[PDB]
Amino acid sequence: GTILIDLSPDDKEFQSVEEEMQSTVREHRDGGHAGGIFNRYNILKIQKVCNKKLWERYTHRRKEVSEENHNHANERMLFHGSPFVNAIIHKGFDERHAYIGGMFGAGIYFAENSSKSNQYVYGIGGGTGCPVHKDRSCYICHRQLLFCRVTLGKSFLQFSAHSPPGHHSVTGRPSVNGLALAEYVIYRGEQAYPEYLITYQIMRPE
Ligand SMILES: Cc1cc(=O)[nH]c(N2CCN(c3ccc(F)cc3)CC2)n1
Ligand SMILES: [Zn+2]
Question: For ligand 1, atom 21, which residue shows the shortest CA distance?
Fold first, then answer.
């Protein structure tokens, strides 16, 4: 029972979601190989993802993690880029959205850097690119990102399935690229809510 409400760009909500998308762009060590070459996005549409069953699935698990961690759910707003975004907004996150070949295990991956999530919009390493031009740096086709409410709880810090014992998620602390932001991994689909569906294009630097 998913409903997508279009957010007006006049709305304070559109303005704060676009600002978290824009300000969290960074240069990638692959030179744009996976996500393309760009410094900003053309934000075409921001939509609120409304689903009573999934929101309840998430706040139920949130209350569990909170009570297991001195009433702190450790809730973040993170980006999620995946070829299975359209399936996530209707069925939620689960074991089919888990990244088997992940660095922090077979869990569901999230990023603080929007530009990081953009690397997985067309698949692992950007796949073959957009389905129309087979271009990983395509500047034409419309891309789609999720801005998710994530319950991290007790997160296992990793400097560089199931969660480490006595923990609720894993934090990928960046230990080489001094400008990278953290990456997070949850092992329960219930621990995340697909809050915002952002439609956009990467923009050719001038
Ligand atoms: C680091 C990071 C940030 C981000 O936004 N997204 C992701 N992924 C990881 C890989 N994914 C995946 C899911 C299910 C599969 F079958 C294969 C891949 C989805 C998106 N990673
Ligand atoms: Zn294209």
Answer: 109
